[PDB]
Amino acid sequence: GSHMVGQLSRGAIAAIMQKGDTNIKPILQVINIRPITTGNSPPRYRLLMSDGLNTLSSFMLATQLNPLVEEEQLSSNCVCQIHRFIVNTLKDGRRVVILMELEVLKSAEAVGVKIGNPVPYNE
C-alpha cells in the first residue's frame, strides 16, 4: 500500500553493521540473488538486500534455505522478515551476514518494484 518504504525496517542495515545486535527481526527487500562460486559443495547464494534507506550485498543464505531460492519463493523484489541471522567477520575485516531463518511476507510478483531509492551502505 501507500508509503511503500514504510513496509521496510529503515535503518536495520546500519544497525546490523554498526551494533550487531541479533535480537531484531528486520523486514528487508531482496533486490538481487546470485550463486557464488562453490565448486564442490552445496550451492551458496549471495543476496543484495534493502531496508529502504540502504542496500547491502554482504548477505549469504544458509544452505538449509536453498529450497526457497530453488523453488522461486525467494527472488528479486520479494519482502522478507529475517527471524534469525548471524554476522561473521573475515580475516580481512569484511563482514558477512548469514540468514538462517526468514519468512517471505510478500512475493516478488505482489510487490513488483524496488521500494524507495536505497543507496549502498559503506563499510
Ligand X SMILES: O=C(O)c1cc(-c2ccc(CN3CCc4cc(-c5ccc(C(=O)O)o5)ccc4C3=S)cc2)n(-c2ccc(Cl)c(Cl)c2)n1
CB of 94 to ligand X, least distance (A): 5
Strand partners, 35: 45
- Which residue, 48 or 78, has its beta carbon nearer to ligand X? 48
If you write DSSP's letter for every residue of the chain in order, what string do you get?
A: --SGGGGS-TTHHHHHHHT-------EEEEEEEEEPP-SSSS--EEEEEE-SSEEEEEEEE-GGGHHHHHTTSS-TT-EEEEEEEEEEE-TTS-EEEEEEEEEEEE-HHHH-S--S--EE---
Closer residue to ligand X in complex, CB, 68/111: 68
Residue 101 as a binder of ligand X (CB under 6 A): the answer is no
Site for ligand X contains 17 (CB under 6 A)? no
Q: Shortest gap between Cβ of 4 and ligand X (angstroms)? A: 26
- Please identify which residue in the block is written with the cell numbers 526457497: 68
| Closer residue to ligand X in complex, CB, 83/94 | 94
Binding to ligand X (CB under 6 A) within 38-67 occurs at 46, 58, 60, 62-64
Q: Based on the shown chain and the rule CB under 6 A, indicate whether residue 113 belongs to the binding site for ligand X.
A: no
What is the binding site for ligand X (CB under 6 A)?
36-37, 46, 58, 60, 62-64, 88, 90, 94, 96, 98
